[PDB]
Amino acid sequence: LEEGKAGSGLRQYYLSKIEELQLIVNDKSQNLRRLQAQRNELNAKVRL
Amino acid sequence: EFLHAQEEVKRIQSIPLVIGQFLEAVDQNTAIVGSTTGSNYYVRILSTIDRELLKPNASVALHKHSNALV
Amino acid sequence: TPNCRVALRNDSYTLHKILPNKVDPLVSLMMVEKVPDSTYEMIGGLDKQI
Numbered sequence: 783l784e785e786g787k788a789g790s791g792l793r794q795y796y797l798s799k800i801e802e803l804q805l806i807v808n809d810k811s812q813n814l815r816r817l818q819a820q821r822n823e824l825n826a827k828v829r830l
Numbered sequence: 831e832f833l834h835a836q837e838e839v840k841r842i843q844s845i846p847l848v849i850g851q852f853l854e855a856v857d858q859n860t861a862i863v864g865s866t867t868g869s870n871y872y873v874r875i876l877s878t879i880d881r882e883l884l885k886p887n888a889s890v891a892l893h894k895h896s897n898a899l900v
Numbered sequence: 901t902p903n904c905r906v907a908l909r910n911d912s913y914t915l916h917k918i919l920p921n922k923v924d925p926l927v928s929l930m931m932v933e934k935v936p937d938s939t940y941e942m943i944g945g946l947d948k949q950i
Contacts, residue, residue, distance in 0.1 A: 824832065827832060828831050828832050828835055
C-alpha cells in the first residue's frame with residue numbers, strides 16, 4: 783500500500799481536521815442569514 | 831435609532847398648542863379640521879390616536895405651524 | 901364637479917386633491933350606520949301586507 787498506509791497517516795490528519803472546519807462554516811451561515819433578516823425587520827421599522 | 835424616533839415623535843404633544851374642532855374624516859389618517867381661528871383647513875394626523883374618539887366631532891388640539899391633529 | 905371641495909396648497913395656491921364627502925352637516929340623523937335590528941320573520945301575521 784503506497785497510498786493506503788499514507789491515506790491513514792498523512793491524509794487522515796487533514797480530512798478529519800477539515801470536517802469540523804466544514805461544520806462551523808455550515809453552522810454560522812444558518813446563524814448569519816438569521817441575523818440578516820432580524821436586521822431587515824428593524825431597518826424596515828425605522829425607515830418607515 | 832428606533833428610540834430616538836420614538837422620542838422626537840412623543841414630544842410633538844408637549845407644546846402650547848392651539849385648540850380646534852374635528853369636522854370630517856377623509857380616509858386613512860387624513861382629515862378636515864376646523865380651528866377656533868376659523869378658515870377651515872385640511873391636514874394629516876398622527877399615528878398614535880385611537881380613531882374611536884372622533885365620530886362626528888371632538889374638541890381637539892392642533893399644531894402651530896403644520897396644524898396637524900395632536 | 902361643480903360645488904365640490906378640493907385641497908388647496910398654502911404654498912402657491914395650487915390644487916392638490918379633490919376632496920369627497922361634500923358639505924352636509926346634518927346627515928348625523930340620516931343613513932344610520934349600524935343595523936343589528938330585528939329580523940324579517942318575527943313580524944308574524946301580516947303576509948298580505950308584506
